[PDB]
Amino acid sequence: GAHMMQARREELLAKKARLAEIKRQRELRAQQAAGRSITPSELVSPTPSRANSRREIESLIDSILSSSAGANSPRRGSRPNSVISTGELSTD
């Protein structure tokens, strides 16, 4: 061992500087790895009382009445309007 071998020990103190360099890597990796763990993972929405749905559940029948097809004007009505004695004759 170096305890009973100063010849080796004295160089080990010299190399101790290199060892401190190795130790420095540990502190380096701290600011490197742990310093670059900036990921704000904050998407916690356990809110049942929130408008987060794409399905007319409360109505149901209204979703069948127009098949929920057409986000402009759903088929709401069954009355031949503006098509009596006009249009369906000669495109007039």
Domain ranges across the chain: 1-36
- Can you say whether residue 85 is alpha, beta or left, with left for phi > 0 and alpha for psi between -120 and 50 degrees? left
Determine the residue type at 23.
K
Q: Given the structure tokens 């098509």, which residue do they identify? A: 83
How many CB atoms lie under 10 A from the CB of residue 11?
11
Instruction: Please state how this structure was obtained.
Output: NMR
The answer to whether 2 touches 12, Cβ cutoff 8 Å, is yes
Determine the residue type at 57.
I
How many CB atoms lie under 10 A from the CB of residue 74?
14
Please report the DSSP string for 68-82 in residue order.
T--SS---------S
